């Protein structure tokens, strides 16, 4: 052989985990940002970034533990261990924002390294990939929320913080400051995911409802051969079932599976191009109508103007406590209080 | 308007039975595009290039 | 300088049931986006 | 009642001109079978 072919005969062996010649970008960058995230939940913390106790070491029991963000007064600078932000000395690197940018970029590059990976095994078995096409759902969520949402706005404090409740803050951020519900690009994504959740539930039912008596025992998935050319579900009784109950039915067994690929992948892509409007905060929280006679007319009483005062309940209540960067302090009769509550 | 009231009145998000639900839903989001991708991937050849590859077999 | 006949141009085959999917998809985008155009 | 003055132009071309694109292609396809 040569010099390079001996290497390409190494990484394409049948090792039990397949290492992959595209895996040398994955396996460093995917053990970091999993294990980079797993120190940020335990040991390194906030409270020098935006005044919060968000670690296991300060003692929050995982449903409010997160590696957070850098500070708001810090810009969009990538917090290198080696940069101006910190010049190594990672003690001071760590608690000055920083950590997450270690797992934001490595989490970005491993997602390149995983989508390079399922392209790479797809040629080795020769299989015509659509998993990499269906990973364009997941990669367009990550690079347009955790990457391209903060770069439209101010620096990476307004990026979501990596935890279960750090995401939950970023949820109620996007309710109040942007109205991320009721803009239409998000609402196709709820049609994508909940439409995707039916089409794996309803397709998971009927293959377990039309089965073909090759076993003589009582459980069904005994004696199903993997090297079996005859098809294990009916599709003639299943089409006869759904032409009667729902009235419409999948009259061929392909495009039943292409629709299950299509329905959550184009859900996330429509959801991905909404937050890039939110990145430059083209929010569409306001209707051009339905507001002038919310101003002139107290007799005009609707759910949308009921909903738009709820978002004022966000933006003047949590914003002194969410962002202590500006030191927002409020004298307790400037806050919108509805009544006795 | 209902959901923000339920987040207000008694706090939906920090509750594990809701958190088990989205784990079913986001799991059901992926497993639709996981199972539906790979049989669409591992389809056999019965057509040529110019037509739809969703044609070379008859229903049933 | 002189014309000929194409050895090309396969026609299109949009199905009856695939018309229903495309007609419905435009009409849900109609009932979604028409509020935002107002 | 206030209105944007141009959405009824916008959401009548948003619904028609892809659907009559789609309505062209069905009657394209269905007339091929029919034994000329």
């Amino acid at each position: 052989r040569g010099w390079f072919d001996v290497l390409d005969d190494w990484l394409k062996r049948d090792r039990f985990v397949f290492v992959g010649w595209s895996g040398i970008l994955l396996f460093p960058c995917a053990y970091l940002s999993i294990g980079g995230w797993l120190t940020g939940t335990t040991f390194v913390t906030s409270w020098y970034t935006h005044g919060l106790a968000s670690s296991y070491l300060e003692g929050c029991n995982f449903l409010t533990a997160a590696v957070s963000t850098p500070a708001n007064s810090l810009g969009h600078s990538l917090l290198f261990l080696w940069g101006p932000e910190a010049q190594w000395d990672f003690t001071r690197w760590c608690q000055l924002g920083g950590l997450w940018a270690f797992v934001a970029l490595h989490g970005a590059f491993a997602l390149i390294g995983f989508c390079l990976r399922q392209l790479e095994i797809a040629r080795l078995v020769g299989i015509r990939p659509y998993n990499a096409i269906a990973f364009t759902g997941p990669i367009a969520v990550f690079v347009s929320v955790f990457l391209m949402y903060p770069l439209g706005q101010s620096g990476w404090f307004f990026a979501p913080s990596f935890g279960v409740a750090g995401i939950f803050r970023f949820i109620l951020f996007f309710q109040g400051f942007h109205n991320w519900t009721l803009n239409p690009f998000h609402m196709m994504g709820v049609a994508g995911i909940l439409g995707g959740a039916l089409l794996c539930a309803i397709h998971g039912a009927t293959v377990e409802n039309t089965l073909f008596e090759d076993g003589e025992g009582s459980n069904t998935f005994r004696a199903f051969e993997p090297t079996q050319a005859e098809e294990t579900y009916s599709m003639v009784t299943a089409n006869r079932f759904w032409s009667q109950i729902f009235g419409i039915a999948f009259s061929n067994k392909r495009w039943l599976h292409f629709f299950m690929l299509f329905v959550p992948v184009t859900g996330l892509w429509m959801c991905s191009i909404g937050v890039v409007g939110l990145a430059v905060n083209l929010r569409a929280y306001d209707f051009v109508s339905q507001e002038l006679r919310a101003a002139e007319d107290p007799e005009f009483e609707t759910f949308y103007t009921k909903n738009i005062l709820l978002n004022e309940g966000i933006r003047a209540w949590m914003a002194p406590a969410d962002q202590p960067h500006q030191n927002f302090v409020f004298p307790e009769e400037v806050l919108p209080r509805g009544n006795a509550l | 308007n209902f959901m923000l009231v339920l987040q207000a009145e008694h706090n939906v998000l920090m509750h594990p039975f809701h958190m088990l639900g989205v784990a079913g839903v986001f799991g059901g989001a992926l497993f639709s595009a996981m199972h539906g991708s790979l049989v669409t991937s591992s389809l056999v050849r019965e057509t040529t290039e110019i037509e739809s590859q969703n044609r070379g077999y008859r229903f049933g | 300088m002189d014309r000929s006949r194409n050895p090309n141009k396969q026609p299109v085959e949009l199905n009856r049931t695939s018309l229903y999917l495309g007609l419905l998809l435009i009409f849900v985008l109609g009932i979604l986006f028409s509020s935002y155009f107002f | 009642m206030e209105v944007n003055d141009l959405g009824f132009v916008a959401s009548i071309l948003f619904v028609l001109v892809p659907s009559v694109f789609l309505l062209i292609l069905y009657i394209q396809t269905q007339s091929r079978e029919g034994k000329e």
Binding site: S251 | - | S34 | I12
Partner: peptide, 29 residues
């Protein structure tokens, strides 16, 4: 200004009726 939904909503309901009556009947072969 108001009858632009009820135009396009009934077209969305009208195509629900035409998919139940005028579907392609799936023939086994």
């Amino acid at each position: 200004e108001s009858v632009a939904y009820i135009l396009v909503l009934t077209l969305a309901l009208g195509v629900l009726f035409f998919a139940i009556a005028f579907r392609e009947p799936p023939r086994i072969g």
